[PDB]
Amino acid sequence: FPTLISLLEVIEPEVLYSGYDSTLPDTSTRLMSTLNRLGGRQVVSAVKWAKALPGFRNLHLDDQMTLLQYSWMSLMAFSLGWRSYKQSNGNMLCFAPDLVINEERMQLPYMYDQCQQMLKISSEFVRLQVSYDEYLCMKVLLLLSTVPKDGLKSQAVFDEIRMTYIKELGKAIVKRESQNWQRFYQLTKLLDSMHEMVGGLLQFCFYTFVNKSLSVEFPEMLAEIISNQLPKFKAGSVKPLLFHQ
């Protein structure tokens, strides 16, 4: 009174709109520019979400920053996978209600490859038939899934918070009709593979960010984050926390 799961549901940000002008044909540069700005704003929401997440603010401030910077992409990508799941059964990418990318719009030269790995995320929800509560739980667990090799400042606080939401995930499964053990295996397996698929998105992203000759614009929020997170990733100094080996 109140249950953790109903706190998750209530703190979940409303879906943001892109304001994309589709009067004239899509240019890949300007689609990516529009996405980045949508992205900035969604990250800003993610930051407010995380602050309201029970346990998060017990962490040292620097650790709050680190976690958000390390996982923003997997959060954004997972939530995208969710909107594409419920909205079009994973057939189209639902970035915003006024920016859906179907098979055609994807054929943009630069787009196709990145788009497939994003599509791979929604198909997983389709295949595993993920519920809302399962998703909400898996989403916080992504926020806590990518850490400095050197560990955090608040390691023991962290370790506990992770435990709590691991158990909250257990509850969302059980809540949803013995073999619940198997579900947990698959869900935690899905969380594991995010590292790989989000890998690629982060690759393109650093690429488009680093190579200013591309004309892909980033908002301040993302730029600050990317330019701080890039050296850390390249130096191979960050670590994924996995459930399986």
């Binding site: 930051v47 602050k51 401030l61 920053m65 958000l68 910077q69 301040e220 929020m221 600050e224 701080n228």
Partner: peptide, 11 residues
């Protein structure tokens, strides 16, 4: 230090 991030995290 990402200034906007930090600004958000400290109220």
């Amino acid at each position: 230090r990402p200034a906007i991030l930090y600004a958000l995290l400290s109220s």
